[PDB]
Nucleic acid binder design. Structure first.
Ligand SMILES: [Zn+2]
Ligand SMILES: [Zn+2]
Lengths: 311, 34, 255, 49
RNA sequence: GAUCUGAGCCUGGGAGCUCUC
């Protein structure tokens, strides 16, 4: 049984468990550190999961200094394994550790690389649809890397005609944007930034600002923070078949900056977060304009993270 | 940038005639292709 | 050197995996044409975009560049190939639908096996397993570029008429069904061959750009008149080797 | 048989199935009805059962 | 009669036909 274009996973040596899905192995010969991601073929109802095909098809395309690199794909003497360039830390883990200290300068660098990464994937017509501190890796040299593109795919620029009908149930409930919670299937890049805004808020809160247990509960929290969802602030929001069928508060006002006031502290920082957590995706600032925000061009200026990683 | 294509007065190209004697007369097999 | 991977020469093709198990050159190509025909037939019955079909055809040509018809039947790889291309081209078709249509084309006599029968459950595994094999054999390189993409862009630029545009695109499909240029020349080059081949047959001649440059120069910087004529020669040479009537159909007979 | 704008996304491309049911005639008109007819009728290439 | 003990080939795709037995 010929198979020259698919080396055996035996070439790697498993060390520990991550994410029995993701493992930390090292090349038996070179000694290079890598991340083994086993393909979950639990649902063999439709052969090889289309979700995997996309991730693989996308990773082979995307190649940025802020995006995880896909080395190769191994097998078993069978199951499939996706090899990536091992990442020492992860935004999620770092924020969880108290010993870790983030300076206003270092924080700006983290987001700068994050948004810079989104700009790439978005420019290449790709949607992550799963933004969270957990998927935000950071190399040993202090280089942010976007990983886990399982729920990621490619969207279209709607040729001014019949809209698209993508999957609705996407992105973590905690990092899921309003539109998705209203039944929006013709979404786009804005859904990713919403998570980025929630992630940038955790850089000071060290914990998810909106932890809902259900879809409706999530909306309630978003309405109490970002304010009540009304046609005024969200034009044509009433068109949603779930707008009226879902009891949403009407009195709650926008208190994004007010709630994150004692945390963020920094003026510019608060302003950016406010533009990223905008209810209406049409008015939601994009990655491009996000990088041009005074937040990234005001003293103190962004700097590497090596100093912080020393703890 | 380009000019709208035109017909060729008696295709003398050896390649052209080779196709004509293979697939047949063009004009007569167009309203069927697609 | 990932580019030159799925691009061989006339000699390499002359020594294909199948040629290693004793399979005449003209015989192998025959299997390829048949495999492409099956994919085209099943695709239309599944109502899938031409893109999905072409993509499936490409995998077929490349798949047999590492494997042999002696080990992998063309009527078996086709179903799996098409089933895979469907997903890649954002147009997946239920495994049940594929097997059903594939059985209608391969077994017009026998009746469609019950979705509960032991025989059916078997065909499922065989197709799924073969699918994984195709992926590994291709190195998981699903991304494929078709000449049709370059053919359409060129026709619109040269301001070619519909009849000419339809023919150009038409020949672009025949190349994947009869020839193996998809394993020899890049899509851009193949696109020029189709248009050039369509022009000679349509008597249409594409003028020279207002800048003094040929049309093919706007499709590929490595394409030359000498190449087109040579390639067009091989294309037709393969067309002449067809086992059916292409001279008797020159009439307006009834139905 | 009919050209398709590449700029269009995979999930946007139209089906390959011909508008009219693949007729059953060897006439010079049906030989080009579709891709299959051309390969099976004009070229006479079949996969058989 | 097979028809992975085969096919050549062709009229409206066989409902046509002959080949080494
Ligand atoms: Zn007819
Ligand atoms: Zn037809």
């Amino acid at each position: 049984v010929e198979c020259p274009f698919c080396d055996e996973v035996s070439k790697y040596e498993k060390l520990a468990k991550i994410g029995g899905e993701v493992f930390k192995a090292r090349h038996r010969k070179t000694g290079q550190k890598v991340a083994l991601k086993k393909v979950l073929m639990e649902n063999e109802k439709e052969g090889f999961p289309i979700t995997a095909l996309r991730e693989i098809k996308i990773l082979q395309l995307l190649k940025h200094e802020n995006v995880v690199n896909l080395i190769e794909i191994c097998r078993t003497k069978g199951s499939i394994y996706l090899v990536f360039d091992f990442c020492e830390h992860d935004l999620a883990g770092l924020l969880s550790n108290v010993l870790v200290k983030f300076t206003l300068s270092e924080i700006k660098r983290v987001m700068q690389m994050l948004l810079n990464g989104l700009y790439y994937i978005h420019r290449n017509k790709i949607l992550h649809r799963d933004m969270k501190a957990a998927n935000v890796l950071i190399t040993r040299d202090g280089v942010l890397k976007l990983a886990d593109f399982g729920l990621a795919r490619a969207f279209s620029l709607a040729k001014n005609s019949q809209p698209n009908r993508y999957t609705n149930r996407v992105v973590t409930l905690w990092y899921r944007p309003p539109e998705l919670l209203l039944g929006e299937r013709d979404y786009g890049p804005p859904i990713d930034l919403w998570g980025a805004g929630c992630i940038m808020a955790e850089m000071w809160t060290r914990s998810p600002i909106m932890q809902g247990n259900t879809e409706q509960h999530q909306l309630a929290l978003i309405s109490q923070l970002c304010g009540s969802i009304t046609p005024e602030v969200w034009p044509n929001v009433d068109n949603y078949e779930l707008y009226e069928k879902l009891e949403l508060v009407k009195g709650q006002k926008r208190k994004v900056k007010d709630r994150l006031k004692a945390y963020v502290r920094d003026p510019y920082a608060l302003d950016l977060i406010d533009k990223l957590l905008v209810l209406d995706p049409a008015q939601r600032i994009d990655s491009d304009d996000a990088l041009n925000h005074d937040f990234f061009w005001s003293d103190p200026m962004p700097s590497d993270l090596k100093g912080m990683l020393s703890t | 940038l380009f000019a709208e294509p035109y017909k060729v007065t008696s295709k003398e190209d050896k390649l052209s005639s080779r196709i004509q004697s293979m697939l047949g007369n063009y004009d007569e097999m167009k309203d069927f292709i697609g | 050197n990932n580019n030159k991977r799925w691009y061989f020469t006339r000699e390499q093709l002359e020594n294909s995996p199948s040629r290693r198990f004793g399979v005449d050159p003209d015989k192998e190509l025959s299997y390829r044409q048949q495999a492409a025909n099956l994919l085209q037939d099943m695709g239309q019955r599944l109502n899938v975009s031409q893109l999905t079909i072409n993509t499936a055809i490409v995998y077929m040509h490349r798949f047999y560049m590492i494997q042999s018809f002696t080990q992998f039947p063309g009527n078996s790889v086709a179903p799996a190939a098409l089933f895979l291309a469907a997903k890649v081209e954002e147009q997946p078709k239920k495994l049940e639908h594929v097997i059903k249509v594939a059985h209608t084309c391969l077994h017009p006599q026998e009746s469609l096996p019950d979705t509960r029968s032991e025989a059916y459950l078997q065909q499922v595994q065989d197709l799924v397993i073969l699918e994984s094999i195709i992926l590994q054999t291709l190195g998981f390189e699903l991304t494929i570029d078709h000449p049709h993409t370059h053919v359409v862009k060129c026709t619109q630029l040269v301001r070619a008429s519909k009849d000419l545009a339809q023919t150009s695109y038409f020949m672009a499909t025949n190349s994947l069904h009869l020839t193996t240029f998809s394993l020899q020349y890049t899509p851009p080059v193949v696109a020029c061959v189709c248009i050039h081949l369509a022009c000679k047959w349509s008597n249409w001649e594409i003028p020279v750009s207002t800048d003094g440059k040929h049309w093919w120069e706007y499709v590929d910087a490595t394409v030359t008149l000498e190449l087109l004529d040579e390639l067009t020669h091989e294309f037709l040479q393969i067309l002449e080797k067809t086992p059916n009537r292409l001279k008797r159909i020159w009439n307006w007979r009834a139905c | 048989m009919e050209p398709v704008d590449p700029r269009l996304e995979p999930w946007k491309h139209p089906g390959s199935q011909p508008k009219t049911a693949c007729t059953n005639c060897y006439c010079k008109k049906c030989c080009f009805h579709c891709q299959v007819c051309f390969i099976t009728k004009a070229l006479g290439i079949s996969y058989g059962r």
